[PDB]
Amino acid sequence: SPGIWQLDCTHLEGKVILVAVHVASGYIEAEVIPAETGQETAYFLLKLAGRWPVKTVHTDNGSNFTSTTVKAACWWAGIKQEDGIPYNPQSQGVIESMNKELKKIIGQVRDQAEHLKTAVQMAVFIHNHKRKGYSAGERIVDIIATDIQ
Amino acid sequence: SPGIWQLDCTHLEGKVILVAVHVASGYIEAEVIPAETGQETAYFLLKLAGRWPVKTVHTDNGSNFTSTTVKAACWWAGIKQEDGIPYNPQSQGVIESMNKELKKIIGQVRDQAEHLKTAVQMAVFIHNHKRKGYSAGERIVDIIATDIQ
Ligand SMILES: O=C(O)c1c(CN2C(=O)Cc3ccccc32)ccc2c1OCO2
Ligand SMILES: O=C(O)c1c(CN2C(=O)Cc3ccccc32)ccc2c1OCO2
Ligand SMILES: O=C(O)c1c(CN2C(=O)Cc3ccccc32)ccc2c1OCO2
Ligand SMILES: O=C(O)c1c(CN2C(=O)Cc3ccccc32)ccc2c1OCO2
Ligand SMILES: [Cl-]
Ligand SMILES: [Cl-]
DSSP states (O other), X not given: OTTEEEEEEEEETTEEEEEEEETTTOOEEEEEESSOOHHHHHHHHHHHHHHSOOOXXXXXSHHHHHOHHXXXXXXXXXXXXXXXXXXSTHHXXXXXXXXXXXXXXXXXXXXXXXXXXXXXXXXXXXXXXXXXXXXXXHHHHHHHHHHHO | OTTEEEEEXXXXXXXXXXXXXXXXXXXXXXXXXXXXXXXXXXXXXXXXXXXXXXXXXXXXXXXXXXXXXXXXXXXXXXXXXXXXXXXXXXXXHHHHHHHHXXXXXXXXXXXXXXXXXXXXHHHHHHHHHOBOOXXXXXXXXXXXXXXXX
């Protein structure tokens, strides 16, 4: 579980928000892109895997699952690429709820920035620091450190 | 402290590579930008602080230290903005040594990507996973986890 991430793609202001969630912790990383392509998805995964020990990625759709550019980035980064099918049905609604919460946070900071990408980074910050009593940021470091020891 | 980071700016192919180093571990995050403005530096720090518990940042030069955009982003993110003056004289050469090593790694992957930004992310990955026997990625998680606990 400590190396498992889920990709998620949501839309806002005619742009795409690409999200990776660390499944065990709820910790997230996100970027704004004009549209979801294999190339953008590949680049995002290279960034992610250089920062956290990404073992497995459940891709967000079949186009990223299929993409030769994505499969190449996963190979390069030592990531096992998986489908994102909610064999546990809980997952569709869990992603739904995350997007809705993320979009709520974005609405709360939207007026503090000109550009969507900036508001998204502020929302990532707020999400990751929110105490739930640990934050997502605390959980991920705890989970991975235990795994190393 | 587990919360201390140093900013560093280096040049390659007529572009700027902005680097944040976690002082205690040597773990790095980096991005390519056209040039080092207050705005770009501010956005890079918002990204960083959403991902790791950034308490203190030693800025890379006086323009970023002075920048009201940078000071506003530090205020927003709860970051203490400090100078990066080598009170330990060994800091100058340590940064120089990191840029040299980073550029060497970039040279080793340069032909595997069209765009500089991609090669820089591959280099971050290689740097952060390199053992010498823990990696920088292991050290940062271990340092912060101990700090939480
Ligand atoms: O509000 C949310 O549900 C939310 C989550 C939930 N999250 C976890 O805690 C574990 C997990 C696995 C797969 C998908 C989502 C989750 C995570 C991140 C969020 C959430 O709201 C905004 O950012
Ligand atoms: O060429 C680029 O800069 C680039 C790539 C290149 N690339 C692949 O197509 C497959 C792969 C695996 C590992 C590393 C790099 C690559 C991919 C994504 C990109 C690239 O520029 C921006 O987004
Ligand atoms: O080769 C390097 O010096 C290097 C470093 C060095 N680094 C640490 O290990 C701890 C530290 C504190 C302050 C500044 C630098 C360092 C870090 C990252 C690197 C390095 O080469 C490429 O990426
Ligand atoms: O307006 C933007 O999108 C933007 C900003 C905005 N901004 C400040 O000027 C000071 C600050 C503190 C906290 C959050 C946002 C801001 C800063 C940097 C940017 C921005 O767009 C891309 O790079
Ligand atoms: Cl493709
Ligand atoms: Cl400025």
